[PDB]
Every structure is written in structure tokens, then in C-alpha cells.
């Protein structure tokens, strides 16, 4: 298993504009288009994103190309971020995939706000950190995905996804 397969499991794949769990306009593999309520603003962002008149629909290939960029951007974001970089550097390869997953979902800023959890991860206090991460709107809003990510941090294995 790898970060790509992992995220593809967590976000799914949709070829037509859709609303995400928060109610925002998304397409492909969890690619947020706009926080705006206008389908029209969404379609416009979409065309800009893809470079063609999509009319709200894209191909598998287009979805994947957006996905590749988003993963790259997630990694680069962590590498550039002063709160995140040190945690990332401290982690083994599987747990690193777990932090990338959070960042892809909630953004750099968002994850950087989990101060206490970040410190615990850094110190390798797995159980403690799993308990702290669960005390969040994140866990409350998307408990199934949050549990898979948390398990990955707790165990350092891909067990939670081997199921799926």
C-alpha cells in the first residue's frame, strides 16, 4: 500500500462535480474546487484547473492528473512548514503517509493547529497521540476515515486499509 492507494480509498473517485462532506464543490479524488456556494463559480474553477471547457465533467486521466498535483503539493507543504517538517522528519514511512493524508484533507494550516498531537507524535507516544487526535471536530465529523488514519499512527502498519 502507498499514499496514493491510501488516499484513493479515503476520498473515492468522482467524474462529475459533487459536494463533499462539508457541502463544498469537489471533483475527482477529493480535489476541492471552491468553498463558494455557486455551481457556476465551481465550474469556472474547474475549467481553469483543467484548461478546457469541461462543462462539470472530467475524464479518469484528468482526475488523476489533479490527484498527482495535490499529493505533490501536500508533501511540499509539509516540507515548507516549520511546525510540520520536524514531525515528518521524525516519522517512519507509514506514519509519514498518515500525516500526508491529514494535510491533503484539512490543509497545512489545519494540521499545524493540532499542536499537542504533533508533539506526541514526535515523541513517539503512539497511544497518547491517538487518544488526543480523537478529540477534534475532525474525528467527530468523519469518524470512519479519522479512525483509519489514527490507527495508522497508532500501529505504524497499514492494517486499517487492508480491510478496504
Experimental method used, please?
Answer: X-ray
User: Has 92 been annotated as catalytic?
Assistant: no
**CATH code for the domain of 42:** 1.10.530.40
Q: Is 153 annotated to bind ligand? A: no
User: How far apart (Å, rounded) are the C-alpha atoms in residues 138 and 116?
Assistant: 15
**Total domains, the chain:** 1
Nearest to 71 by CA among 31, 19, 26, 125: 31
3 state DSSP class of 24 = coil
User: Has 11 been annotated as catalytic?
Assistant: yes
Report whether 33 contacts 17 (CB < 8 A): yes
**What is the domain extent for residue 68?**
1-164
CB-neighbour burial class of residue 11 (10 A; exposed 0-12, middle 13-18, buried 19+): buried
Amino acid at each position: 500500500m502507498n499514499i496514493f492507494e491510501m488516499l484513493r480509498i479515503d476520498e473515492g473517485l468522482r467524474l462529475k462535480i459533487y459536494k463533499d462532506t462539508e457541502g463544498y464543490y469537489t471533483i475527482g479524488i477529493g480535489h476541492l474546487l471552491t468553498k463558494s456556494p455557486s455551481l457556476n463559480a465551481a465550474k469556472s474553477e474547474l475549467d481553469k484547473a483543467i484548461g478546457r471547457n469541461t462543462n462539470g465533467v472530467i475524464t479518469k486521466d484528468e482526475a488523476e492528473k489533479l490527484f498527482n498535483q495535490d499529493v505533490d503539493a501536500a508533501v511540499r507543504g509539509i516540507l515548507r512548514n516549520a511546525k510540520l517538517k520536524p514531525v515528518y522528519d521524525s516519522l517512519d514511512a507509514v506514519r509519514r503517509a498518515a500525516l500526508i493524508n491529514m494535510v491533503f484533507q484539512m490543509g497545512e494550516t489545519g494540521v499545524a493547529g493540532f499542536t499537542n498531537s504533533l508533539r506526541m507524535l514526535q515523541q513517539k507516544r503512539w497511544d497518547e497521540a491517538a487518544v488526543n487526535l480523537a478529540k477534534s471536530r475532525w474525528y467527530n465529523q468523519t469518524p470512519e476515515r479519522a479512525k483509519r488514519v489514527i490507527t495508522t499512527f497508532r500501529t505504524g502498519t497499514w492494517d486499517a486499509y487492508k480491510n478496504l
